[PDB]
């Protein structure tokens, strides 16, 4: 299977600063990497599809970059309601797999 590794597992940031979250794949997955936000007792919320594709309704401060085995979710000027968990997920090959997540915390 493809293993997705997210680093760091915890990032503490001050609101209004920017952050970059890393997702690395054990083998190449082209651009077939998606990003989700996860908050308590809710379903994951899709932020970015196909590495860099922006989607309707998601605040512009979220963007994705990367390809192959190295991906980044950038949040420009983090807001407090952005604190929570972030997961990447590949759809390049079956079985689809998720990274272990990065928890974004208020410093």
């Amino acid at each position: 299977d493809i293993v997705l590794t997210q680093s760091p597992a915890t990032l503490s940031v001050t609101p209004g600063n920017s952050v970059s979250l890393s997702c690395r794949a054990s083998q190449s997955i082209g651009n077939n990497l998606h990003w989700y936000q996860q908050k308590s007792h809710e379903s994951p919320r899709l932020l970015i599809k196909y590495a860099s594709q922006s989607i309707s309704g998601i605040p512009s401060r979220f963007s994705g970059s990367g390809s192959g085995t190295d991906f980044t979710l950038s949040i420009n000027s983090v807001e407090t309601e952005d604190f929570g968990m972030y997961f990447c997920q590949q759809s390049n090959s079956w079985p689809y797999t998720f990274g272990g997540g990065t928890k974004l915390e208020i410093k």
Binding site: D1, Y36, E42, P44, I55, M85, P95, F98, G101
Partner: protein, 113 residues
């Protein structure tokens, strides 16, 4: 928009089969692709499987053949059966459209003696 809703038991015992229903409203399951995904209480996410527009199913090998996905097109519903459950299967079970935009609210299933 699409709405999805899971239904089934809240509590099951070890070695029981866990059976869930996903009811889909506002989009047909005989087109596109439909998924089951679970979230463990420690927040780990696992993609369980999906069923294509023609009924072809895909299962995560992690499930060691304990999983069956089936459908009832006449009611726009699809199903998850997971055999021989253990405490490792306590999780919140989501059905989702395979594009990831639309998810059920999720149903928490606890496996306990």
């Amino acid at each position: 928009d699409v709405q999805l809703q899971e239904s089934g038991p809240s509590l099951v015992k070890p070695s029981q089969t866990l059976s869930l229903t996903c009811s889909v409203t506002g989009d047909s399951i005989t087109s596109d692709y439909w998924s089951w995904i679970r979230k463990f209480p420690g927040n780990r996410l696992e993609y369980m499987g999906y069923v294509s527009y023609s009924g072809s199913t895909y299962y995560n090998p992690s499930l060691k053949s304990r999983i069956s996905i089936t459908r009832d097109t006449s009611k726009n519903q699809y199903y998850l059966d997971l055999n021989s459950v253990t405490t490792e299967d306590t999780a919140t079970y989501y059905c989702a459209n395979w594009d990831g935009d639309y998810w059920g609210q999720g149903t928490l299933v606890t496996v306990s003696a």
